[PDB]
Design a protein around this ligand. Structure first.
Ligand SMILES: CN1CCN(c2ccc3[nH]c(-c4c(N)c5c(F)cccc5[nH]c4=O)nc3c2)CC1
Ligand SMILES: [Cl-]
Ligand SMILES: [Cl-]
Length: 294
């Protein structure tokens, strides 16, 4: 097929033999599939680990390859954290590139939240559990900011949830060209990504840790609305006009004034005035401690 024009250098720190990998069902679309890995840890060769594997489609170009490589190398550099999707290994030699990453069995946080809305098929979440989820997501972002990583698309759809209900930030290492970002393309739930972007990111294409903090304000809103859709019915130009006039979303029905205040602070018009992720981690810690299970 032409796969591939260049040569991939080997990296013994991360390489896994291809036959140690037992590929399973598609998880999403580069496409990500569930797989079983035999002997991921080279001191325990007879255990399988469920993992997710990212790979190129048959249609891919040298550019897609380069992008996937960039994400893998960024992930090597950023190192490990409980609340991000971690690099586990890679198959780079003698065949298609496979990037092996942590598997989150309950899927993305948006659907996870929606599936637990009171009926009108699992159980409802307590206030404490919602705040704990915000807290975990903030800890992940604080780790990434400390490693000088700007996410640029933080949203519930890019938070994954493990078997053990651990929140893990995903897709922080993607290489995208913000200038070819089409404001009109929609997500696969049908929503417009532009609704998570800070105004200076939106209008001026300036991406900072402060604009990530704006996005985290929107994610908080998602959490306390149980996976609700920001600015429903609103198209891109009307959104621009809302933001230019200083509109901010209403306080979700079940949500304390302290948490809504946290949201509004994340949405400060002056970026320097927004809290940092470190501050959010401390505030959410205290609030988790003061929130009832019941
Ligand atoms: C009934 N249940 C619904 C939720 N279920 C589910 C659905 C989709 C899912 N995608 C991932 C997943 C990624 N998409 C992913 C990535 F795109 C990059 C890096 C790591 C990744 N890890 C993942 O674990 N997990 C999923 C679980 C399992 C079945
Ligand atoms: Cl590490
Ligand atoms: Cl979404």
């Amino acid at each position: 097929a032409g796969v591939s024009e260049y040569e991939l250098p080997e990296d013994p720190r991360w390489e896994l033999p291809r036959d140690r990998l037992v590929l399973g069902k598609p998880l999403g679309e580069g496409q990500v599939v569930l797989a079983e890995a035999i002997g991921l840890d080279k001191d325990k060769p007879n255990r399988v680990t469920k993992v997710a594997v990212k790979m190129l489609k048959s249609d891919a170009t040298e550019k897609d390859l380069s992008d996937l490589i960039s994400e893998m190398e960024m992930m090597k550099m950023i190192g490990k954290h409980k609340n991000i999707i971690n690099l586990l290994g890679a198959c780079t030699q003698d065949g298609p590139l496979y990037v092996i990453m942590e598997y989150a069995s309950k899927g993305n946080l948006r659907e996870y939240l929606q599936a637990r809305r009171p009926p009108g098929p699992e159980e409802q979440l307590s206030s404490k559990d919602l705040v704990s989820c915000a807290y975990q997501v903030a800890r992940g972002m604080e780790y990434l900011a400390s490693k000088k990583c700007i996410h640029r698309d933080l949203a519930a759809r890019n938070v994954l949830v493990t078997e053990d209900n651990v929140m893990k930030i995903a897709d922080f290492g993607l290489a995208r060209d913000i200038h070819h970002i089409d404001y009109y393309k929609k997500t696969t739930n049908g929503r417009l990504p532009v609704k998570w972007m800070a105004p200076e990111a939106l209008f001026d294409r300036i991406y900072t840790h402060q604009s990530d903090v704006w996005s985290f304000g929107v994610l908080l809103w998602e959490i306390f609305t149980l996976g609700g859709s920001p600015y429903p019915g609103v198209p891109v130009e009307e959104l621009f006009k809302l933001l230019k006039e200083g509109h901010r979303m209403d306080k979700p029905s079940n949500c304390t004034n302290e948490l809504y205040m946290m949201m509004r602070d994340c949405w400060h018009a002056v970026p320097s005035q927004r809290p940092t992720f470190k501050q959010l981690v401390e505030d959410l810690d205290r609030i988790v401690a003061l929130t009832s299970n019941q």
